[PDB]
Amino acid sequence: MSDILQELLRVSEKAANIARACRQQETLFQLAVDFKTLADVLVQEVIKENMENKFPGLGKKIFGEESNELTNDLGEKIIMRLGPTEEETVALLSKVLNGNKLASEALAKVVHQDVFFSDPALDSVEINIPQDILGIWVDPIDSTYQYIKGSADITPNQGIFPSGLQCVTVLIGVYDIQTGVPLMGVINQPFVSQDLHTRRWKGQCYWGLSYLGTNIHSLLPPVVVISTSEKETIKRIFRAAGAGYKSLCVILGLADIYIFSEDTTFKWDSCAAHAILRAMGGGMVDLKECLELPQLVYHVGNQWANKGGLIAYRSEKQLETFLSRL
Ligand SMILES: [Gd]
Ligand SMILES: [Gd]
């Protein structure tokens, strides 16, 4: 599914463009009217539509944390369907934004904008996966709170950002419908490095593939350590915002373990990161099951919450080392 994965890298950067666009443009920045739900519902639809456009029959296999439905200020329930032309999308968004024409024409231009983001490494890869066995968990913009606050001035504690826009991630995971094993995953940090003078944000994309014993993943920059959420309350540890980011810390090797005790993460939070951690010999396990190892499945519903928490590990040896102490 390299051709599918290659296409998922594009829409992830297209999703990042929308995420960056809303914050960086005054009309969309200044924004009853729940903008974030709109920003989420829009990004997940753009991914859903673009993949159905390039691979017919994937549209109905793409699941996410948002619906394709928004309730405007009047109480009118609008089915978020974009295109086919740019004009149609402006008429749709104006029905949501009470007839804000400047904001509607702003989003539409970024949504229909072409992006040609292509890894030369993955062009060399020719892997075929049957499309009939694929299911996709999308998280449009993970760390919704941090995205809205928009802190560009946070100093990281030993490589790990406790808060800020660095914690915001676009998560796209692909899994096996029958076995429930994660196969492919894309993570896009829209906000990584901001130039102080031009105020522009540069992002960073990561991916991984684990299909029938073939394991490949994006080139990782160089340079136990445990990461937990800011609301964590169970017994060298770091606080860090965002589910997807804390998972990316394990992938980058900034942290050795990421443990979450509560049941308030779902399939769309973990799936993307899992597939990548799988491609590096690691993975994710049910915490409560380990305390009494098994991997997380993404095909059956408990509904779609990872009940009994999780542990995200890079090395199964480091997992045993950590599980020994506790
Ligand atoms: Gd989200
Ligand atoms: Gd999330």
Burial class (CB in 10 A: 0-12, 13-18, 19+), 148: middle
Helices marked H in 236-303:
243-252, 267-278, 287-291
CB 77 within 8 A of CB 69: yes
Spacing, Cα 64 to ligand 1 middle (Å): 9
How far away, in angstroms, is 186 Cα from ligand 1 center? Answer: 15
Q: What is the largest CA-CA distance in the chain?
A: 60
Distance CA 209, CA 275 (A): 6
CA of 242 to the centre of ligand 1 (A): 10
DSSP 167: G
Ligand in closest contact with the CA of 15: 1
Q: Of the candidates 6, 15, 11, 16, which has an alpha carbon nearest to the alpha carbon of residue 192?
A: 16
Is 243 annotated for ligand binding? yes
> What's the rounded Cα separation, in Å, for the pair 306 and 224?
24
Place of tokens 């308030």: 264
> Would you say 65 is a known binding-site residue?
yes
Spacing of C-alpha 301 from chain mean position:
20
* Other beta carbons within 10 Å of 33: 13
- Give the number of whichever ligand sits closest to the CA of residue 268: 2
- The pair of structure tokens assigned to 182 is 């994660």
Enumerate domains of the chain plus CATH numbers.
1-66+114-220 (3.30.540.10), 67-113 (4.10.460.10), 221-326 (3.40.190.80)
- Helix (H) or strand (E) segment spanning residue 109: helix 101-112
Residues lying with their CB under 5 A of ligand 1, a single-atom ion:
141
CB neighbour list of residue 301: distance below 8 Å, 6 or more residues apart: none
Residue 147 CA to ligand 2 centre (angstroms): 12
> Does 246 appear as a known binding residue?
yes
* Dist. CA 313–CA 318, nearest whole Å: 7
**Cα 139 to ligand 2 centre (Å):** 6
Residues 6+ apart with CB under 8 A from 212: none
Query: Minimal CA–CA distance to 180: which of 62, 57, 301?
Result: 301
Closest CA to 180 of 284, 54, 44, 57: 284
Establish whether 94 is an annotated binding residue.
no
101: its two tokens? 């024409």
- 3-state DSSP assignment of residue 135: strand
Report d(CA 165, CA 145) in Å as an integer. Answer: 10
Cα distance between residue 278 and residue 161, in whole Å: 24
Nearest 5°: CA angle at 291, between 285 and 295? 15
**195 labelled binding-site residue:** no
**Ligand 2 centre and the CA of 151: distance in Å?**
19
Q: Catalytic positions, please?
A: 40, 65, 139, 141-142, 144, 269
Q: How was this structure determined?
A: X-ray
CA dihedral sign, ordered 272, 275, 281, 284:
positive
Burial of 275 (0-12, 13-18, 19+ CB in 10 A): buried
Which ligand sits closest to the CA of 141?
A: 1
Query: Is there a binding annotation on residue 153?
Result: no
Judge whether 274 and 173 are in contact, CB under 8 Å. yes
> Å resolution of this model?
3.2
| Residue 81 neighbours by CB under 8 Å, 6+ apart | 45, 68, 92
